[PDB]
């Protein structure tokens, strides 16, 4: 079949998989946020 | 995130909604293969301590009335709703139980042998040698754990002092205190083994997934040459 359409948007999935609360739930996720803060990213998470 | 569905603390005769596993654990990984889907089923809380005297009552032999013998999705054997006093409780049904029958549950250890009527629960001391029994309990007051499948009967081989030898359905001999409670007769659905599944789809109804498609003595040095 034709590929390239693997993104099937869903806001509930997006915020649950990559959101603020998800990232702060684990120390590894908190370190992800710290790295993005040190780089200066405007968007720390979804 | 997996929470077991077995979270009900109070005994009831109301059927309980069961969540299926698929063979996974609380971790979420497969631990047992061949488990998936099937028909949705409801759990009926069985009571395996036949001699449970009712609340606020003395521990003496009592009788119960058989309301109905139902079909159990969760078991090979069939269950019977039995009523006595003001209490209803599900139990395992023997070979010949019918609706409206009366079954005894006795604490008394007969000094002499007690006549064996199928469906009545007596201590193994009361029973005479050779009587078929089912729903045996390893330890007094523990609750039935053995011979509770369809059609399975255990023979009471011997009694000496306060100990009896029970031959389990696998022919493995077990010993227990004669104070332990057993139910006379074999379990119902005596012809459960004669069933024919017939088609692959019927097994998938029962929550069984297909098997995988995937398809050691070491000689000692003296024998290594001669292998």
């Amino acid at each position: 079949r034709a590929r390239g359409n693997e993104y099937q948007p869903s806001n509930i999935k997006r915020k649950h998989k990559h959101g603020w609360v998800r990232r702060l739930s684990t120390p590894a996720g908190v370190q992800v946020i710290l790295r993005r803060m040190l780089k200066g990213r405007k968007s720390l998470s979804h | 995130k997996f929470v077991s569905w077995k979270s009900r603390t109070k005994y009831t005769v109301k059927p309980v909604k069961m969540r299926k596993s698929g063979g996974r654990d609380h971790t979420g990984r497969i631990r047992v293969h061949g488990i998936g889907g099937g028909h949705k089923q409801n759990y009926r809380m069985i009571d395996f301590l036949r001699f449970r005297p009712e609340k606020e009552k003395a521990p003496e032999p009592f009788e119960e009335k058989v309301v109905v013998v139902r079909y159990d999705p969760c078991r090979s054997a069939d269950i019977a709703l039995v009523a006595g006093g003001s209490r209803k409780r599900w139990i395992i049904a023997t070979e010949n139980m019918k609706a409206g029958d009366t079954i005894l549950n006795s604490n008394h250890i007969g000094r002499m042998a007690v006549a064996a009527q199928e469906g009545d629960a007596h201590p193994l001391g009361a029973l005479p040698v050779g009587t078929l029994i089912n729903n045996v309990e390893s330890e007094p007051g523990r609750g039935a754990q053995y011979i509770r499948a369809a059609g399975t009967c255990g023979v009471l081989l011997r009694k000496v002092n306060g100990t009896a030898i029970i031959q389990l359905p696998s022919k493995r001999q077990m010993q227990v205190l004669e104070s332990c409670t057993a139910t006379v007769g074999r379990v119902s659905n005596v012809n459960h083994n004669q069933r024919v599944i017939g088609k692959a789809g019927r097994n998938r109804w029962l929550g069984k997934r297909p098997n995988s498609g995937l398809w050691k003595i070491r000689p000692l040095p003296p024998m290594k040459s001669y292998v």
């Binding site: 993104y7 948007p9 806001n11 405007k42 968007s43 979804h46 | -």
Partner: protein, 122 residues
């Protein structure tokens, strides 16, 4: 493919997603899915009578602006409290216990308008 930079508002997402736009709550949602508005929770505008009032939006360009002197605790204290204590000290009828006589408030509890923590809006 999602937009990460735009704000998260109730217009976006599924119907189940809802959130406020910053309006203060005026009531409670009780059981039975019922909204019960509370009269006290609804702000009431205290509007004065403007009849006979001489102050208008603008001022004469010929009106002199004064020297800027922001009000301080000392300035307030001298204007209000100092004369009373000074007069009482000369008469000798002054004691530490009765500072409330001159306007001191030992505690803010029981006041409709508490200075700290503030319990009234602007």
């Amino acid at each position: 493919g999602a937009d990460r930079m735009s704000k998260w508002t109730s217009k976006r997402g599924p119907r189940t997603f809802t959130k406020s736009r910053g309006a203060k709550k005026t009531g409670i949602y009780t059981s039975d899915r019922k909204f019960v508005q509370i009269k006290e929770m609804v702000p009431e505008f205290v509007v004065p009578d403007l009849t006979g009032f001489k102050l208008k939006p603008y001022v004469n360009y010929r009106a002199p602006a004064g020297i800027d002197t922001p009000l301080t605790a000392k300035a307030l204290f001298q204007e209000t409290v100092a004369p009373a204590i000074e007069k009482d000290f000369k008469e000798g009828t002054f004691d530490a216990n009765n500072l409330e006589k001159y306007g001191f408030e030992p505690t803010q509890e029981g006041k409709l308008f508490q200075l700290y923590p503030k319990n009234f809006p602007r």
